Design a protein around this ligand. Structure first.
Ligand SMILES: [Cl-]
Ligand SMILES: [Cl-]
Ligand SMILES: [Cl-]
Ligand SMILES: [Cl-]
Length: 135
């Protein structure tokens, strides 16, 4: 329990998470200039319209907005995290870090499937889902 829209303050992040009752909130916490972050953002732009009925994506440059860097141990240049009704959703991706997707993905359908799985689990009141695919 806590163009794509950038969030420019810890207040704005809090607000985006706490105010959304219907959809999964996807936050990309990153060092925006890093190539891995840029790679992940291309993917987010490609899938955003496909998932807009069940998921809203926000971008946060953690060099500018560092407020959650200890809270979520944000050491990586890209960490995609998911929230439903103010609850941080876990995703067992087979990597042994269930808190975040912290590598650039480049398969559009694979990511969409992960977002859908998280949403569907969240809607059942689950705090953790097993990714449709082992990573
Ligand atoms: Cl702001
Ligand atoms: Cl603030
Ligand atoms: Cl609803
Ligand atoms: Cl659960």
């Amino acid at each position: 329990h806590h163009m794509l829209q950038h969030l420019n303050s810890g207040w704005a992040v809090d607000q985006a998470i706490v105010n959304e009752d219907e959809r999964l909130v996807c936050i990309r916490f990153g060092h925006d200039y890093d190539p891995d972050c840029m790679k992940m953002d291309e993917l987010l732009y490609k899938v955003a319209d496909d998932i807009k009925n069940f998921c809203v994506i926000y971008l946060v440059d953690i060099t500018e907005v560092p407020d959650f860097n200890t809270m979520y141990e944000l050491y990586d240049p890209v960490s995609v995290m998911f929230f439903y009704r103010n609850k941080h959703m876990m995703i067992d991706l087979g990597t042994g870090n269930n808190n975040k997707i912290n590598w650039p993905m480049n398969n559009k359908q694979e990511f969409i499937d992960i977002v859908e799985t998280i949403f569907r689990g969240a809607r059942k009141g689950r705090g953790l889902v097993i990714s449709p695919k082992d990573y």
